[PDB]
């Protein structure tokens, strides 16, 4: 999380729902608020910041943290030169010597692992599709209807017939009619009343059968049935799926020729940041958005109108970026291993992943 500091320069004091004060660190980087993009001091706090702080606790090394300039994780490209291609992003910051380490949810892949070393994964995660969820509030007055009201009025007519039959059987007035209407909500008198009672019970049971039938809705087989779905496989003009351009997801989709159609569908609707795509998915501007399950499940937990698709694909992990020539990656990977072993990651995940009750 990144937030601007108060004019005094002091970071604002905040605490987790558990009653634990949230640690914060100073990071200089580009502000999306200002018209220009000068790097400014801002307070950054979160799972990664806590991990870096804990690492600085276990290992005596201190840390100077700052936000990346381009605002993207990392990519390999050349804008003006066909001859040679260069890295951009935090990866580029790591290879340029601008940073000796990169602490962030940077997805581990073969392309990035060539130039830079990755610490043992602190978080195991994969890609899942996120689509908008809606609470099907309906039928309240309309499931008052589905009896068509012809059958209920016919019930009233049957009540009238039962009252007439009651009069005829008792002969063989108003109070009897009121008693009949009350029953709704000689031998043949009792027969008529019994048949009326059975028909009323049957009517209630039919209303329950209609109610129970009407409650089940929208059928199984939702919009996203997994990574492979007709709606996902065939990009209809109605259903629009996208991802963040110039990211690991982009490289993954652009890598395979099978996913080239999906890349053609995403390329037009693609966004620079995941936040705009999430806001678009929430406003139903974008039908589906593919991204990390770590962020996606957290967003689905945060907002109940958003649900992530099942059948997680592309099993991967997040780790601290390190240069191969730097001796800190050994003890860093060891420290992450011990971090998982002790169960600190359990408390950290219970901390930053809220899993709200959606009250």
């Amino acid at each position: 999380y990144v937030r601007p500091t108060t004019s005094d320069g002091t970071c604002r004091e905040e605490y987790t729902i558990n009653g634990d004060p949230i640690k914060k660190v100073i990071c200089n980087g580009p502000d999306e608020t200002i018209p220009g993009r000068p790097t400014v001091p801002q307070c950054c706090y979160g799972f990664c910041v806590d991990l870096l702080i804990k690492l600085a606790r276990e290992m005596d090394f201190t840390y100077e943290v700052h936000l990346v300039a381009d605002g993207k994780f990392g990519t390999q490209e050349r804008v003006n030169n066909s001859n040679a291609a260069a890295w951009n992003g935090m990866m580029g910051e790591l290879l340029s010597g601008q940073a000796d380490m990169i602490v962030a949810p940077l997805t581990i892949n073969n392309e990035r692992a060539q130039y830079i070393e990755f610490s043992k994964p602190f978080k195991y995660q994969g890609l899942t599709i996120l689509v908008k969820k809606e609470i099907p509030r309906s039928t309240l007055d309309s499931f008052m209807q589905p009896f068509q009201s012809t059958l209920w009025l016919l019930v009233g007519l049957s009540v009238h017939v039962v009252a007439v039959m009651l009069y005829l059987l008792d002969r063989f007035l108003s109070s009897a009619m009121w008693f009949s209407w009350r029953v709704l909500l000689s031998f043949s008198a009792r027969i008529l009343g019994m048949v009326w009672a059975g028909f009323a019970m049957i009517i209630v049971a039919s209303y329950t059968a209609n109610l129970a039938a009407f409650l089940v809705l929208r059928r199984p087989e939702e919009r996203i049935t997994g990574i492979n779905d007709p709606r996902l496989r065939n990009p209809s003009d109605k259903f629009i799926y996208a991802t963040v351009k110039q990211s690991s997801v982009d490289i993954y989709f652009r890598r395979q020729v099978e996913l080239s159609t999906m890349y053609r569908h995403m390329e037009k609707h693609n966004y620079e940041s995941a936040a705009e795509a999430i806001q678009a998915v929430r406003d139903n501007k974008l039908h589906a958005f593919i991204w990390d399950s770590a962020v996606l499940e957290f967003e689905a937990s945060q907002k109940c109108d958003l649900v992530t698709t099942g059948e997680l694909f592309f099993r991967s992990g997040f780790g601290i970026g390190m240069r191969k020539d730097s001796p800190w990656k050994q003890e860093v990977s060891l420290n992450i291993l011990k971090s998982h072993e002790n169960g600190f990651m359990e408390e950290l995940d219970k901390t930053w992943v809220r899993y709200q009750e959606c009250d």
Partner: protein, 39 residues
């Protein structure tokens, strides 16, 4: 380039089996598994 040099194949559009799309102005040619055809 002209296709004349073969077994020329004529077809007709029926979904899902046959799907015809407009050629990409930005690409300039067909992409992925799509194949060029003339009418």
């Amino acid at each position: 380039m002209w296709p004349v040099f073969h077994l020329s194949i004529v077809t007709l559009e029926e979904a899902p089996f046959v799907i015809v799309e407009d050629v990409d102005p930005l690409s300039g040619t067909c992409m992925r598994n799509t194949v060029p055809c003339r009418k």
